[PDB]
Design a protein around this ligand. Structure first.
Ligand SMILES: [Zn+2]
Lengths: 306, 394
């Protein structure tokens, strides 16, 4: 019933069965192949009007409902072009697919405000994205566009508004031997289906996640809300180490910095305020994006958690 | 972002039922004349159309002072327009030599008996459109928020149900419109909201949203920010985009679909990824350098994008070094290393390159970069890259 109820669908694993919407397109095709190579259970996909074909040796369906019923998929990943992406997400929501990952960059904001409106009034479907790299449970399930080889199954949960910055954090935590429990890229758009607190909740309750890296950047107040969530849920008696890096310290105000949601507007959304809010929530903020791995490593050492 | 001339956003508003000053745009002194006549107005405002601010106290190269003139006489509008069109208008906000004025707006001059602030924006925090208004008009809404938060009013609008009469009336009342004027303003609010939805605006800000002594509710001035993602369905509006006042490189980068933002530094940089690009700009500053620009090649990291990026950074004479940091994207590193050394040779760049490539085929990538004979330093990680790029410039 409540959207926060679908939070748990974020935790993909070796049992997650995935279909691709926008399956026959160039992007859907390419990442589907990488997904199969990785071992992800990609079981088919949809492309309206091309149902009844196979592609990459898998069944193609005209609708998400048919695909879901015929394969038992519990997740959908969307690579549909922007003009149709909101319809793609709505179709998945109507089909009650537990988890929808919308990779698509470029969806109109107005389109997402509408999608989010339906989204918040149901609890069957959890949406991550749009404009996000996806989610990955190292060695078990990869849904999205991240390079699979830099990941190593381990102890750090990573949530991030940025794809490439996540690859930095994974590469670094893999080098220090900590590895990653689950990596979630919530994307760079202003209106999206999953924020940091959604992921933090999963991470704080996850026995496998012993530490958390939170990666944010300018714009909105998702980081500040995450600091509130942590002050309430991670400040004792329970306390997992949380390290963060916030991009955009030097960004010029008023310009969309690549990401549609990366903008300091009305003097709101600056980096310093996000850093300050996190520090006060117990988060150790690494000022350098090259030091996330070593920073969380020392936190573990301090706590004698190595 | 999309940049509209005053006459263009006012046309947009008037074509959509929103009340603005009546006006015409003129190309010639003569058209300015006939337009002033057609208006049939007691008083006329002649305004040069340039995007920069400070028009009022700017100066034309014809010697004419002021980019905004008032007059009751149509023929003066013609004479003044003749001293504007084709000349350069310089203001405290344009380059030194001013901006060529190709058009003037001739509008009826309305008195403003009351000024309020009205805005409609997509608010991330409210998951939707919010109506923001203040009785305290004509001022930057931020100042008003600092000094008097109690005077800022917000109505979260439900995107599915639309704006409610009740909401529009309440806002009009909150902005202090009274009697018949409250219904007129409530009505203008509904038309602004529809306009906001129709053109895929992320924000429509009317300041002042006000009334004239003759009891009219008018959007005297407005600024509209458009959602770039909606371009495919707002083609006519984006076409009106005036790029005549943008930094050339900014424009060039856009031809080739690149997110380029100039800064004042000397260390150029390109990265695939908005986050990583911001982080690179950041870590260069943390390490004591000044980034020359923000440039996101995106995650789809193509060889031709790398090449175009180099072509772009060739235009900036301040660049003393380039930090290339690529990690991610479906294209292996060896292909990226190739486009880099090819770009270098063919565009004949002579500045040092600090390169950080991480991903598939890094070994071969490192080989291609090493055997290129080019002044290329291969960095260990991002911090190393920043320190080395900073060490490479004055
Ligand atoms: Zn930069």
């Amino acid at each position: 019933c409540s959207y926060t109820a679908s939070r748990k669908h974020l935790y993909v694993d070796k049992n997650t069965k995935v279909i691709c919407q926008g399956f026959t397109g160039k992007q859907g095709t390419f990442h589907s192949q990488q997904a199969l190579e990785y071992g992800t259970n990609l079981v088919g996909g949809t492309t309206p009007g091309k149902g009844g074909k196979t592609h990459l040796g898998l069944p193609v369906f005209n609708t998400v409902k048919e695909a879901k019923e015929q394969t038992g998929a519990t997740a959908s990943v969307i690579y549909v072009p922007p003009p149709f992406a909101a319809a793609a997400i709505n179709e998945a929501i109507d089909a009650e697919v537990p988890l929808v990952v919308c990779i698509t960059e470029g969806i109109p904001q107005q389109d997402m405000v509408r999608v989010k409106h339906r989204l918040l009034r149901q609890g069957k479907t959890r949406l991550i994205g749009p404009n996000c790299p996806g989610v990955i449970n190292p060695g078990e399930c990869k849904i999205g566009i991240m390079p699979g080889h830099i990941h190593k199954k381990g102890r750090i949960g990573i949530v991030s508004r940025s794809g490439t910055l996540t690859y930095e954090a994974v590469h670094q935590t893999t080098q220090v031997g900590l590895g990653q429990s689950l990596c979630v890229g919530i994307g760079g758009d202003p209106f999206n289906g999953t924020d940091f607190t959604d992921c933090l909740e999963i991470f704080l309750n996850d026995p496998a996640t012993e530490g958390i890296i939170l990666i944010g950047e300018i714009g909105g107040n998702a980081e500040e809300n995450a600091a509130e969530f942590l002050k309430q849920h991670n400040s004792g008696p329970k306390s997992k180490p949380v390290v963060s890096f916030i991009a955009g310290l030097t960004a010029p105000p008023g310009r969309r910095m690549g990401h549609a949601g990366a903008i300091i507007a009305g003097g709101k959304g600056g980096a310093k305020e996000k850093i300050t809010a996190l520090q006060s929530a117990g988060v150790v903020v690494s000022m350098s994006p090259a030091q996330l791995g070593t920073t969380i490593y020392k936190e573990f050492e301090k706590r004698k958690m190595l | 972002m999309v940049n509209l001339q005053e006459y263009q956003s006012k046309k947009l508003m008037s074509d959509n039922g929103v009340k603005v000053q009546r006006f015409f745009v003129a190309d010639t002194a003569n058209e300015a004349l006939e337009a002033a006549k057609r208006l049939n107005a007691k008083e006329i405002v002649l305004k040069a159309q340039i995007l920069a601010g400070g028009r009022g106290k700017g100066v034309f190269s014809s010697g004419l002072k002021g980019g905004v003139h008032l007059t009751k006489d149509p023929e003066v509008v013609g004479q003044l327009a003749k001293q504007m069109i084709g000349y350069n208008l310089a203001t405290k906000q344009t380059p030194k030599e001013g901006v060529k004025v190709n058009k003037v707006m001739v509008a009826e001059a309305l008195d403003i008996s009351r000024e309020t602030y009205l805005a409609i924006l997509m608010d991330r925090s409210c998951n939707g459109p919010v109506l923001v208004g203040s009785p305290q008009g004509g001022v930057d809404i931020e100042e008003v928020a600092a000094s008097n938060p109690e005077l800022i009013f917000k109505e979260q609008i439900d995107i599915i149900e639309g704006i409610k009469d009740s909401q529009a009336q309440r806002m009009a009342e909150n902005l202090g419109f009274l009697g018949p004027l409250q219904n007129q303003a409530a009505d203008q609010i509904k038309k602004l909201y529809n306009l906001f939805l129709k053109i895929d605006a992320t924000q429509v800000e009317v300041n002042p949203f006000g009334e004239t002594p003759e009891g009219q509710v008018v959007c005297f001035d407005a600024k509209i920010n458009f959602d770039d993602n909606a371009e495919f369905r707002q083609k006519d509006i984006f076409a009106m985009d005036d790029k005549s006042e943008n930094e050339p490189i900014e424009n060039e980068a856009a031809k080739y679909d690149l997110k380029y933002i100039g800064l004042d530094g000397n260390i150029a940089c390109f990265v695939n990824g908005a986050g990583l690009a911001m982080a690179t700009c950041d870590i260069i500053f943390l390490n004591g350098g000044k980034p020359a620009n923000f440039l996101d090649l995106g995650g789809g990291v193509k060889e031709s994008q790398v090449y175009q990026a180099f072509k772009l950074l060739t235009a900036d004479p301040k660049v003393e070094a380039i930090l290339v940091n690529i990690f991610g994207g479906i294209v292996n590193c060896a292909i990226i290393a190739n486009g880099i050394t090819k770009a270098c040779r063919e565009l004949e760049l002579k500045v040092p390159l600090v390169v950080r490539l991480e991903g598939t085929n890094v070994h071969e990538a490192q080989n291609i970069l090493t055997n290129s004979g080019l002044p290329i330093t291969s960095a260990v990680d991002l911090e190393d890259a920043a320190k080395k790029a900073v060490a490479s410039v004055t």
